[PDB]
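User: For a benchmark we're assembling, each entry needs the component sequences followed by a predicted structure for the full assembly. Here are entry 17's components. Please fill in the structure.
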Amino acid sequence: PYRVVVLSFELLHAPATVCGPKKSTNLVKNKCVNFNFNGLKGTGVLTES
Amino acid sequence: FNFSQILPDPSKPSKRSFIEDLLFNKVTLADAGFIKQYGDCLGDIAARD
Ligand SMILES: *[C@@H]1O[C@H](CO)[C@@H](O[C@@H]2O[C@H](CO)[C@@H](O)[C@H](O)[C@H]2NC(C)=O)[C@H](O)[C@H]1NC(C)=O
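Assistant: Structure for entry 17:
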């Protein structure tokens, strides 16, 4: 006998349920960098506010 | 003929006379703005103007 599991996720994305943002990275300051803090696209320099 | 008001004043930073000082403080809406060594608004703790 073998132990088998079925992973069945449906489609069409209207009940957006599980997802994953993941890949949380480090931070830099006083540098010309691209930032993606929450999915926002942009570039520039980061400092303390 | 009195001339205190319009003659330049040695007893003042910059030799700006009384009346022109009065005008300069009456306008007070240019707020310089001619990049009086600008490029210092990197960290905008305030509302960035
Ligand atoms: C020209 O007019 C000015 C107007 O202010 C005179 O300045 C006054 O001078 C007296 C002299 O003691 C002071 O007590 C006043 O306080 C001054 N006025 C102000 C507003 O501070 C000035 O003296 C006049 N010129 C001459 C030669 O008298």
